[PDB]
Amino acid sequence: AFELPALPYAHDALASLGMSKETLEYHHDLHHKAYVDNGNKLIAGTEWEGKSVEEIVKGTYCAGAVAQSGIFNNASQHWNHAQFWEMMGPGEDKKMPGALEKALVESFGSVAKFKEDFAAAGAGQFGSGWAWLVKDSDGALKITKTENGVNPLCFGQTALLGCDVWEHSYYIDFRNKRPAYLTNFLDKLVNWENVASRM
Amino acid sequence: AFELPALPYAHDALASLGMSKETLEYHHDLHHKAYVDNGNKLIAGTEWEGKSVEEIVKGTYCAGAVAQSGIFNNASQHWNHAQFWEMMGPGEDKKMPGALEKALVESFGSVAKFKEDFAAAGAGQFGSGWAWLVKDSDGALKITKTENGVNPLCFGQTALLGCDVWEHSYYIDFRNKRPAYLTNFLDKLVNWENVASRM
Ligand SMILES: [Ca+2]
Ligand SMILES: [Ca+2]
Ligand SMILES: [Mn+2]
Ligand SMILES: [Mn+2]
């Protein structure tokens, strides 16, 4: 029983910050909805129907497969998009909590360096996927990238921040300019309080 | 070096058939150009600098890998896009040559069935990639699908038709409606004479 979560803001709340109303309508109301609906259809009457999204992602991931199952593809994307919406928010010059800032400075040298590494990872995922800031099982903060719906749950990592680099996430607003999208995302869209709360 | 081939028609020649001028400008002038340029930059001063695109694709493909090298990613996409532009063309109700029609009926039961299977493969490639009609090493025709830049050269197959299902190929004109794009492509855009010539 996957459900499409409401956005934590109006569909037009990110427009002045570089993610248009049109993008949120297509991305949330159609793409995320499809992962929920297709996920439910595929999961119905299987061993996975009882389970949490997290359990389904971890249980259906096939390590080393180029292509994952339909159940994985939809379950993982459902979870990813749910995090993504919460990781952004309205407001000019959103502030970074101390504990997060300190950890970023310690792991990357500076927030500016963190942001450059994150943007580089996003640009570097060839095809569809995600860039992430994760806390790994040693407690280290680091940048990762994944294909398609694959995500930090597949590696026993905790997602702190994710940025969708599937083309649908940015093509309306940035066309081919994935690097400008990533930069803008990090500078204007990220809700750092939500990021910090995942630590 | 790799060079960006000119389109075999004006940038606006497919607009009345459902692929806009804007799509061809971004897709050819920016995306394909990036594969050429990034390909060249990565190939410069390597073992591959002398070689044909085909040799580079076959030589750099890693069958045992989730992600391919930068050289592979760009070389394969350069080849794919070069084929793609020639596989489409202007004109309402473009002629399908007899030899191709016969071969499709022989392999798929009917042209309609071929088109359904091709569209299903395109819809079924989760994330970025390609749908193909190929002649395999037994000389039979079949439908395949591949991720990212992976293509029939990687499997000792001959590409007859490819349809780009990376989102940039359709998002301007169809947004999330990849199935409508595929249907339209098969109905209006394919230059069947170019397809037949590859047999
Ligand atoms: Ca809409
Ligand atoms: Ca017709
Ligand atoms: Mn998405
Ligand atoms: Mn393309």
Question: What can you tell me about this protein's structure?
Answer:
The structure is a homodimer of 199-residue chains. The longest helix of chain A has 23 residues, at 21-43. In chain A, strand 1 (129-135) and strand 2 form a beta hairpin. The first copy, chain A, has a three-stranded antiparallel sheet. Chain A contains eight helices and three strands, in the order H-H-H-H-H-E-E-E-H-H-H. Chain A has one domain (1-199). The two termini of chain A are 28 Å apart. By secondary structure, chain A is mainly alpha-helical. At the A-B interface, helix 1 of A face helix 1 of B. The structure holds calcium ion (2 copies) and manganese (II) ion (2 copies). One calcium ion is lined by residues 93, 187 of chain B. The PDB classes it as oxidoreductase. The entry lists the keywords superoxide oxidoreductase, SODs, metal ion binding protein., oxidoreductase. It forms a dimeric assembly. The entry is titled "Crystal structure of the iron/manganese cambialistic superoxide dismutase from Rhodobacter capsulatus complex with Mn".
